Design a protein around this ligand. Structure first.
Ligand SMILES: C[N+](C)(C)CCO
Ligand SMILES: C[N+](C)(C)CCO
Ligand SMILES: C[N+](C)(C)CCO
Ligand SMILES: C[N+](C)(C)CCO
Ligand SMILES: C[N+](C)(C)CCO
Ligand SMILES: C[N+](C)(C)CCO
Ligand SMILES: C[N+](C)(C)CCO
Ligand SMILES: C[N+](C)(C)CCO
Ligand SMILES: C[N+](C)(C)CCO
Ligand SMILES: C[N+](C)(C)CCO
Ligand SMILES: C[N+](C)(C)CCO
Ligand SMILES: C[N+](C)(C)CCO
Ligand SMILES: C[N+](C)(C)CCO
Ligand SMILES: C[N+](C)(C)CCO
Ligand SMILES: C[N+](C)(C)CCO
Ligand SMILES: C[N+](C)(C)CCO
Ligand SMILES: C[N+](C)(C)CCO
Length: 398
């Protein structure tokens, strides 16, 4: 072909070569003869948008790296420099410089990679990049919008930390803890409200939860129920929950304007009697749970009176202004009727409807006699009324 003459290259025709590539077969290499008829060495050449590098001796660098003032560049088989391409496990940017410690998006793979301190791309490992945690699978691809063991990586590949996320395929809410794993059997406070995450992390919604000593109920949106009533259509009963969400059970509660009482199991007492154990008295609740107080109730063959404060009237007298008469209640609240009783110092008779005899003549069929009672129900015994004598025992003598 041609003949080397020092730095010069005389071609077949004598004319020394310049501004041209020549392939010499002895050296088995490409060389570039500059414009000054010398071969290029230890320098870059720009031809088109292509960059070549010619090593000591003029040999064109091909399939190898070339360090330019700290930065590293790769020259392919044709001697050309590479751009936005993978050289094995490393990456060259649009300037052809080796990327080290930075993010990389490759449109060919439609994925993200991170190049590490060693110039290699991360693979099958967790890395903490400027605070956040990212995961790369086999091949270096960055994982996005999915679950890894107990963590979730958002659409950006970052691990979620201290956040709420909704899985549409599971149809449940999860809270991701500060540590990166989801909450598991614990209470979480979010914007003024408490939520309970269940054994799988699934947020508890419309269900009962037992913590340490009492019951909690979680509503439609998973919020703890507190300071309110909830009707259990399964259990067919009303429950109440207080300041902390604690269901109240074996204790009393004021709501609307009525006292209420909640039984051992948190069921509101309704249409029934209850016996307080620290008050040692009986109480009765209407249909709807409302404490009856100062009003009559008819249970089984007996009338009862519950006074201004709701306690049962028993071994005591009561005036009832609505019916305008006096009544007496025995041991147990049993209102007395068609009976005598000894109180004060005189006798008292209570009519069939329970009303005490007050200012009237009454025929006791029992003793077959006519008795009279003065204002206040006091039987008359040794005196005259309307010219009618009365004996030592109260009977009419005549
Ligand atoms: C110095 N390089 C030629 C390698 C890059 C500048 O374009
Ligand atoms: C072939 N080289 C360019 C290396 C030397 C010729 O003198
Ligand atoms: C270096 N070669 C001449 C072989 C290719 C440049 O286009
Ligand atoms: C982009 N990968 C690292 C997966 C391939 C390198 O050739
Ligand atoms: C650059 N990343 C996409 C990897 C994270 C920020 O969005
Ligand atoms: C969906 N998670 C796997 C995060 C919880 C169930 O185990
Ligand atoms: C706890 N979240 C606020 C995420 C759900 C409300 O229902
Ligand atoms: C049980 N909680 C933590 C939900 C309430 C405390 O007041
Ligand atoms: C006894 N409660 C109704 C409160 C809980 C049922 O699981
Ligand atoms: C107060 N309750 C909700 C228990 C009943 C009202 O009708
Ligand atoms: C006193 N009542 C009429 C309500 C009941 C009769 O058994
Ligand atoms: C029923 N009361 C609330 C009136 C007293 C019970 O402690
Ligand atoms: C229920 N009693 C009959 C006791 C009185 C009603 O006015
Ligand atoms: C009928 N009371 C409930 C008032 C008493 C039970 O012995
Ligand atoms: C004077 N009595 C009222 C006792 C009887 C008259 O019928
Ligand atoms: C006060 N009464 C006369 C109404 C009965 C109890 O002594
Ligand atoms: C009221 N007495 C007891 C005096 C007569 C009825 O037995």
């Amino acid at each position: 072909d041609g003949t080397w003459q020092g730095k010069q290259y005389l071609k077949e025709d004598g004319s020394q070569a310049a501004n041209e590539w020549v392939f010499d077969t002895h050296y088995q290499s490409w060389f570039y003869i500059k414009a000054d008829a010398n071969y290029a060495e230890n320098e870059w050449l720009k031809q088109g948008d292509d960059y070549f590098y010619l090593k000591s001796g003029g040999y064109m660098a091909k399939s190898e790296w070339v360090e330019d003032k700290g930065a590293f560049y790769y020259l392919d088989q044709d001697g050309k420099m590479k751009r936005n391409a993978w050289v094995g496990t490393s990456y060259v940017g649009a300037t052809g410089a080796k990327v080290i410690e930075d993010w990389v998006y490759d449109s060919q793979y439609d994925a993200w990679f991170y190049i590490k301190a060693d110039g290699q791309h991360a693979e099958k490992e967790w890395l903490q990049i400027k605070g956040k945690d990212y995961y790369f699978k086999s091949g270096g691809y960055l994982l996005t919008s999915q679950w890894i063991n107990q963590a979730y990586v958002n659409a950006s590949g970052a691990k979620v930390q201290q956040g709420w996320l909704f899985d549409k395929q599971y149809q449940s809410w999860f809270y991701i803890k500060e540590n990166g794993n989801y909450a598991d059997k614990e209470w979480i406070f979010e914007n003024g409200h408490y939520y309970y995450l269940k054994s799988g992390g699934y947020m508890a919604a419309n269900e009962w939860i037992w913590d340490k000593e009492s019951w909690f109920y979680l509503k439609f949106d998973g919020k703890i129920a507190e300071k309110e009533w909830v009707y259990d259509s399964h259990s067919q009963a009303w429950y109440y929950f207080k300041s902390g969400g604690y269901m109240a059970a074996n204790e009393w509660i004021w709501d609307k304007e009525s006292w209420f009482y909640l039984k051992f199991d948190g069921k509101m007492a309704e249409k029934e009697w209850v016996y307080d154990s620290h008050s040692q008295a009986w109480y009765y609740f209407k249909s709807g749970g409302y404490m009856t107080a100062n009003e009559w109730i008819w249970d089984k063959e007996s009338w009862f009176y519950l006074k201004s404060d709701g306690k049962i009237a028993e071994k005591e007298w009561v005036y009832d202004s609505h019916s305008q008469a006096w009544y007496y209640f025995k041991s147990g609240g049993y209102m007395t009727a068609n009976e005598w009783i000894w109180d004060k110092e005189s006798w008292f008779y209570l009519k069939s409807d329970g009303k005490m005899a007050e200012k009237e003549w009454v025929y006791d069929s029992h003793s077959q006699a006519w008795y009279y009672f003065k204002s206040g129900g006091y039987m008359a015994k040794n005196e005259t009324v309307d010219g009618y004598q009365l004996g030592s025992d109260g009977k009419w003598l005549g």
